[PDB]
């Protein structure tokens, strides 16, 4: 057991191992209550997260367990991973607080004149991380520029696992939190799956090529009209797959529109980039390109290496369908804290 020391940060008393020094508040609070520090064991600048009220309700206790399970699983160069997890508690009986440690992320994609070569390398890395995530049967659901960390060498990592489900108010109006969402999830058309993430990668790729948001809708309905003007209105085959009779009836009220010519929308872009966008931005999610297929596309010929695009160990999420009491979720979380083994 390390020695812990106390200090007052972000309105509470933080208690952390002596290895973590020079603690200083950082960020807007998007990922929780976070301090920057220097880790004397590894030599890395790190982010230290103190969870607020981890076990206050069944909802919060299960949320805390989910975040810790996901972060413990992810071991890939293009995905956020866990450097450490700790508690000052000496037993289950006194366990109340959880602290998570990751690499400190400076800039996101938002923060960064991009050459076609820059767009190839950034989208290649998102797809390499997504092939890994999808091989574990994990769906990200919230890929957007603010969730992509990027360094001076253009190296990228994917963020945002096991945080609170976004609220209806958070998805309302002229907001970046909705602009990257697949239409079948934005409007609850059907049971969605991992294909929603490939729609998001198409929206990000288009914005790196043009410098402009692809679908900056003022509300859900304005955004749907911008999407159907580009990719066309649904045919009989997709309309059958829309489970909601009410959503099917609204779609049928709109005048039919053909798919647009993407060479006339993305004027001057690499023709191989135009071809890949056509295969990501397909309205029927069954017909979209997969991450594994997209890595083998000719746009990435300079970076693609089939012997260095790894898959994940299997990920058991049977807990997601389990009903437990607060103290049961708290005991599962405690076991995951004390069993943690750090990376080499
Ligand atoms: N659950 C997470 N997804 O992405 C993250 C980035 C940082 C942190 C941190 F450092 F605050 F713990 C947590 C997460
Ligand atoms: Cl220590
Ligand atoms: Cl990392
Ligand atoms: Cl504690
Ligand atoms: Cl964003
Ligand atoms: Cl597992
Ligand atoms: Mg998110």
Which residues, at least 6 apart from 135, have a Cβ–Cβ distance to it below 8 Å? 311, 312
Q: How was this structure determined?
A: X-ray
In what helix (H) or strand (E) does residue 21 lie, and over which residues does it extend?
strand 20-25
- What is the domain extent for residue 250? 107-300
Ligand 1 touching residue 102 (CB < 6 A): yes
Q: For residue 141, report the phi and psi dihedrals to the nearest 5 degrees.
A: 80, -15
Which residue matches tokens 């089939």? 306
Q: Are 145 and 206 in contact (CB under 8 A)?
A: no
Decide: 44 and 103 in contact? Cβ < 8 Å.
Answer: yes
Instruction: Output the CA 121–ligand 6 centroid distance in Å.
Output: 31
Distance 48 CA to ligand 2 centre (A): 14
- What CATH number is given to the structural domain containing 293? 1.10.510.10
- Closest by CA to 280, choosing from 217, 212, 178, 196, is 196
Which distant-in-sequence residues (6+ apart) come within 8 Å of 162 by Cβ?
63, 66, 67, 68, 69, 70, 71
**Residues near 93 by beta carbon (within 8 Å), at least 6 away in sequence:** none
CB 136 within 8 A of CB 315: yes
Provide the 10 A C-beta neighbour count for residue 28: 7
Surrounding ion ligand 7 within 5 Å at CB are 142, 160
CA–CA separation, 252 and 334 (whole Å): 52
Tokens linked to 47 = 């982010």
Residue nearest to atom 7 of ligand 1 (CA): 31
CA dist 50 and 101 (Å) reads 9
CA 30 to chain centre: 13
| Ligand 1: residue whose CA is nearest its atom 13 | 31
CA 197 – CA 207 distance, rounded (Å): 16
137 is catalytic: no
Q: Which helix (H) or strand (E) holds 283?
A: none
- DSSP for 83-107, written as a single string: SEEE-S-SSSTT----EEEEEPP-E
Contact (CB, 8 A) for 228 and 255: no
176 CA from centroid of ligand 5 (Å): 5
The number of C-alpha atoms within 13 Å of 189 and in the hemisphere containing its C-beta is 24
- Helices 195-210/271-280 angle, 10° precision: 150
- Residue 328 Cβ inside 6 Å of ligand 1? The answer reads no
- Atom 1 of ligand 1 has which residue's CA nearest to it? 161
The binding site for ATP comprises 26-34, 49
12-17 and 4-9 strand pairing = antiparallel
Catalytic residue among 153, 160, 169, 284: 160
**Which of 139, 126, 27, 12 lies closest to 79 in space, CA to CA?**
126
Q: Using CB atoms within 10 A of its CB, is residue 11 exposed (0-12), middle (13-18) or buried (19+)?
A: exposed
Surface-to-core class of residue 235, CB atoms within 10 Å of its CB (0-12 exposed, 13-18 middle, 19+ buried): exposed
Resolution of the entry in angstroms: 1.8
Classify 17 as helix, strand or coil: strand
Give dist(CA 186, CA 171) in Å, integer.
9
CB of 163 closer than 6 angstroms to any ligand 1 atom: yes
CB-CB contact of 154 with 331 (8 Å):
no
Query: Contact 160/337 with Cβ under 8 angstroms?
Result: no
Tokens 């982010």 belong to: 47
Å from CA of 18 to ligand 2 middle: 4
Q: Which residues of 86-97 are buried (b: 16+ CB within 10 A; e: fewer)?
A: bbbbeeeeebeb
Residue 289 Cβ inside 6 Å of ligand 1? The answer reads no
Cβ contact 83:100 at 8 Å: no
Helix-strand-coil split of the chain, %, nearest 5:
40, 15, 45
Binding positions: 26-34, 49
Give dist(CA 332, CA 87) in Å, integer: 14
DSSP summary character for residue 79: B
Residue 135 phi, psi (nearest 5): -65, -25
Distance of CA 258 to the CA centre of its chain: 32
For residue 158, list its beta bridge partners.
79, 148
8-state DSSP, 158: E
Beta bridge partners of 7: 14
Instruction: Indicate whether residue 216 lines ligand 1 (CB < 6 A).
Output: no
> How many angstroms separate the CA atoms of 178 and 219, rounded?
9
With the most atoms of ligand 1 within 8 angstroms of its CB, the residue from 23, 28, 32, 166 to mutate is 32
HSE-CB of 179 using CA atoms within 13 angstroms: 18
Residue among 95, 92, 100 at smallest CA distance from 67: 100
Any alpha helices (H) in 25-75, and if so which ranges? 58-73
Nearest ligand atom owner, CA of 86:
4
Given a contact cutoff of 8 angstroms between Cβ atoms, the answer to whether 87 and 97 are in contact is: yes
- DSSP-derived letter for residue 35 is E
Q: Report CA(28)–ligand 5 centroid distance (Å).
A: 14
Alpha helices in the chain (DSSP H): 58-73, 116-135, 176-179, 183-186, 195-210, 220-231, 236-241, 245-252, 262-265, 271-280, 291-295, 326-338
**CA nearest to 92, candidates 342, 341, 323, 328:** 328
User: Could you tell me how many residues make up the chain?
Assistant: 344
- For 256, phi then psi, to 5°, come to -65, 145
């Amino acid at each position: 057991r390390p020695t812990f020391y106390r200090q007052e940060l972000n309105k509470t008393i933080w208690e952390v191992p002596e290895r973590y020094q020079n603690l200083s508040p950082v960020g807007s609070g998007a990922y929780g209550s976070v301090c920057a520090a220097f880790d004397t064991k590894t030599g890395h600048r790190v982010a230290v997260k103190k969870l607020s009220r981890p076990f206050q309700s069944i909802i919060h206790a299960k949320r805390t367990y989910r975040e810790l399970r996901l972060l413990k699983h992810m071991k890939h160069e293009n995905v956020i991973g866990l450097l450490d997890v700790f508690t000052p508690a000496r037993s289950l009986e006194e366990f109340n607080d959880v602290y998570l440690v990751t690499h400190l992320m400076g800039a996101d994609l938002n923060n960064i004149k991009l050459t076609d070569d820059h767009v190839q390398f950034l989208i290649y890395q998102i797809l390499r991380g997504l092939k890994y995530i999808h091989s574990a049967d994990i769906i990200h659901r919230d890929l957007k520029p603010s969730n992509l960390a990027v360094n001076e060498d253009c190296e990228l990592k994917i963020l945002d696992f096991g945080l609170a489900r976004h609220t209806d108010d958070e998805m309302t109006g002229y907001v970046a939190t909705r602009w990257y969402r697949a239409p079948e999830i934005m409007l609850n058309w059907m049971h969605y799956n991992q294909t929603v993430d490939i729609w998001s990668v198409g929206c990000i790729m288009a914005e790196l090529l043009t410098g402009r948001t692809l679908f900056p809708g003022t509300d859900h309905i304005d955004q749907l009209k911008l999407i159907l003007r580009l990719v066309g209105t649904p045919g009989a085959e997709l309309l059958k797959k829309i489970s909601s009779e009410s959503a099917r009836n609204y779609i049928q009220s709109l005048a039919q529109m053909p798919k647009m010519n993407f060479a006339n929308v993305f004027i001057g872009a690499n023709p191989l980039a135009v071809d890949l966008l056509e295969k990501m931005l397909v309205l029927d999610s069954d017909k979209r390109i997969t991450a594994a297929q997209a890595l083998a596309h000719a746009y990435f010929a300079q970076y693609h290496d089939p012997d260095d695009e790894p898959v994940a160990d299997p990920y058991d999420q049977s807990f997601e369908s389990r009903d437990l009491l607060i103290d049961e979720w708290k005991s599962l979380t405690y076991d995951e804290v004390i069993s943690f083994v750090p990376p080499p």
